[PDB]
Design a protein around this ligand. Structure first.
Ligand SMILES: *[C@@H](C)[C@](*)(O)C(=O)N1CCN(c2nc(OCC34CCCN3CCC4)nc3c(F)c(-c4cccc5cccc(Cl)c45)ncc23)C[C@@H]1CC#N
Ligand SMILES: Nc1nc2c(ncn2[C@@H]2O[C@H](COP(=O)(O)OP(=O)(O)O)[C@@H](O)[C@H]2O)c(=O)[nH]1
Ligand SMILES: [Mg+2]
Length: 170
């Protein structure tokens, strides 16, 4: 049979949320994608032998806090926390995103993966060690990705799926 997973991708504008999602869904790199479009994308994949339907909310929009937005976000079973390794502000923003996740899920135990995107770029500003300690302090996996070269893209989403499965066992 099959299993469905609702994934939500969050992080600062321009970190590559849409590029990452389109790599997962369409298996190529799309370097210009309207920064204002928020939508959900599907894709069925086999992950550890199990047919997995991924429903991925690529976030955009305004920074508004309302019960409507909380309702969309609360539907997510797991979250990708995305920063760009060449943008320190996007990395500093991660703490805020995780807090809003914890708020709408009413739990500190929410499946999440920390994703340092743009690993293909030469002028890294966020050290891999800084990111690993942030993920360790959250108790979550960390992966560096490049939506440009597709490095780590599959594993980032599949690791999040594996984190959800565990959480569902409780
Ligand atoms: C680009 C800049 C354009 O405006 C855009 O597409 N954005 C920016 C606004 N969005 C947004 N931003 C933040 O954080 C911005 C930050 C970080 C520290 C706090 N502030 C002020 C300026 C920098 N946070 C957001 C949200 F938290 C949500 C949201 C709202 C309610 C509930 C939940 C629950 C879980 C997760 C999230 Cl993301 C929730 N929405 C937007 C938002 C939107 C977009 C960037 C993104 N993603
Ligand atoms: N070099 C490089 N550029 C990227 C990568 N991912 C996204 N980009 C670029 O970063 C910008 C923002 O990407 P986008 O997918 O729109 O980010 P979003 O706002 O988080 O949806 C665009 O110019 C993309 O071409 C990556 O892994 N490597
Ligand atoms: Mg986008």
């Amino acid at each position: 049979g099959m299993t469905e997973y609702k994934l939500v991708v969050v992080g600062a504008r321009g970190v590559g949320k849409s590029a990452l999602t389109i790599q997962l869904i369409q298996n190529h790199f799309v370097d210009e994608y309207d920064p204002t479009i928020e939508d959900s994308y599907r894709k069925q994949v086999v992950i550890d032998g199990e047919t997995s339907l991924l429903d991925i909310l690529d976030t955009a929009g305004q920074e508004e806090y309302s019960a409507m937005r909380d309702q969309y976000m609360r539907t997510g079973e797991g979250f990708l926390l995305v920063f760009a390794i060449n943008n320190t502000k996007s990395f500093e923003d991660i703490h805020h995103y995780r807090e809003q996740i914890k708020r709408v899920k009413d739990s500190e135990d929410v499946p999440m993966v920390l994703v340092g995107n743009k690993s293909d770029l030469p002028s890294r500003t966020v050290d891999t060690k800084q990111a690993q300690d942030l993920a360790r302090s959250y108790g979550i996996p960390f992966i560096e990705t490049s939506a440009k070269t597709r490095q780590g893209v599959d594993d980032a989403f599949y690791t999040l799926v594996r984190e959800i499965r565990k959480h569902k066992e409780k």
